[PDB]
């Protein structure tokens, strides 16, 4: 198909935003990720949000993502440079920056 689900949208620069994917419902936890042995290892966290499937049916095996906020950008950026290509619990986690949370349009707004 047409690889480009998110086409029309506003340009938002999110550097101080840790976006991790491929997290098992078990790993997807605020306290678990906050722990100094999980993510806190890099540095103290300010905000921790968990994004997972809202409606559960039991047909396929979807994936969830977590958004961690690092008081210090430097710490965050690097934390992602090292987190990438890293094996955790047998599953290779993937961290990146520059992801959106809400939809500008939603409001409505400038629509």
Cα separation, 102 vs 65, whole angstroms: 14
| DSSP assignments along the chain, one per residue | --S-SS-S------SS-EEEEEE-TTT--HHHHHSTTTTTTTS-EEEEEEE--SS--SSS---EEEEEEESSHHHHHHHHHHHTTEEETTEEEEEES----S-SSTTT---
Residues 6+ positions from 24 with CB-CB distance below 8 Å: 89, 91
Question: Obtained via which technique?
Answer: NMR
CA dihedral defined by 60, 52, 99, 38, rounded to 10 degrees?
-110
Neighbours of 45 (CB within 10 A): 19
Structural domain boundaries of the chain?
17-97
Topology of domain 17-97, per CATH? Alpha-Beta Plaits (3.30.70)
């Amino acid at each position: 198909g047409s690889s480009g689900s998110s086409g029309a949208s506003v340009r938002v620069v999110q550097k101080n935003l840790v976006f991790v994917v491929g997290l098992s419902q078990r790993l997807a936890d605020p306290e678990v990720l906050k722990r100094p042995e999980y993510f806190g290892k890099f540095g103290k966290i300010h905000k921790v949000v968990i994004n997972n499937s809202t409606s559960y049916a039991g047909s396929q095996g979807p994936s969830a993502s977590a958004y961690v906020t690092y008081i210090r950008s430097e710490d965050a950026l690097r934390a992602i440079q090292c987190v990438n290509n890293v094996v955790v619990d047998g599953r290779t986690l993937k961290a990146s920056l520059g992801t959106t949370k809400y939809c500008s349009y939603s409001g409505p707004s400038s629509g």
